[PDB]
From Swiss-Prot:
It is found in: Secreted. The lineage of its organism: Bacteria, Bacillati, Bacillota, Bacilli, Bacillales. Ca(2+) binds at D15, D34, T35. The active site is at R29, E37, R75. The chain holds residues 89 to 223 of 231 of the full protein. Residues 109-129 are annotated as: Disordered. This is Nuclease A. It comes from Staphylococcus aureus. Residues 109-125 have a biased composition (Basic and acidic residues). It comes from the Bacteria.
Length: 129
């Protein structure tokens, strides 16, 4: 997989963010995770966590996997990086997302993320508390 440039347009929630990619505004949905909806428990905390990570970044990058790059809603499907740190992984590691939506052929980072989830769960963080 390859990292590509993007810039922040706007934070949205824990697992979606509006970025400019190849010069076009797109909503991105983070691969292999599920944050609570803002309406739900830990929803606001997940939103805040992603918002801080993407707003504080000097450099946003997106990384597409081997399969589908857009979902049925036109959202980009990617791993997102803030100054080299994966947002997807960071959410899971903090117990603010579950590993989820693991589709064949877009699951390169699955085992990385499941390891972070095990650690979050061992620490009883957030969703696992
Ligand atoms: C993360 C992800 C979501 N989706 C679709 C599946 C779900 O369809 P449904 O809307 O019919 O439930 C939805 C969940 O995204 P959200 O968790 O953002 O709601 O997005 C993909 O198709 N591929 C993906 O990789
Ligand atoms: Ca969600």
């Amino acid at each position: 997989l390859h990292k590509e440039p993007a810039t922040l347009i706007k934070a949205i929630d824990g697992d979606t963010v509006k970025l400019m990619y190849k010069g076009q505004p797109m909503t991105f949905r983070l691969l292999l995770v599920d944050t609570p909806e803002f309406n739900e428990k830990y929803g606001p905390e997940a939103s805040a966590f992603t918002k801080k990570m993407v707003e504080n970044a000097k450099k946003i990058e997106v990384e597409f996997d081997k399969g589908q790059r857009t979902d049925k809603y036109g959202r980009g499907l990617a791993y997102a990086y803030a100054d080299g740190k994966m947002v997807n992984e960071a959410l899971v590691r903090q117990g603010l997302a579950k590993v989820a939506y693991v589709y064949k052929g877009n699951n390169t980072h699955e085992q990385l993320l499941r390891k972070a989830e095990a650690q979050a769960k061992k620490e009883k963080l957030n969703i696992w508390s």
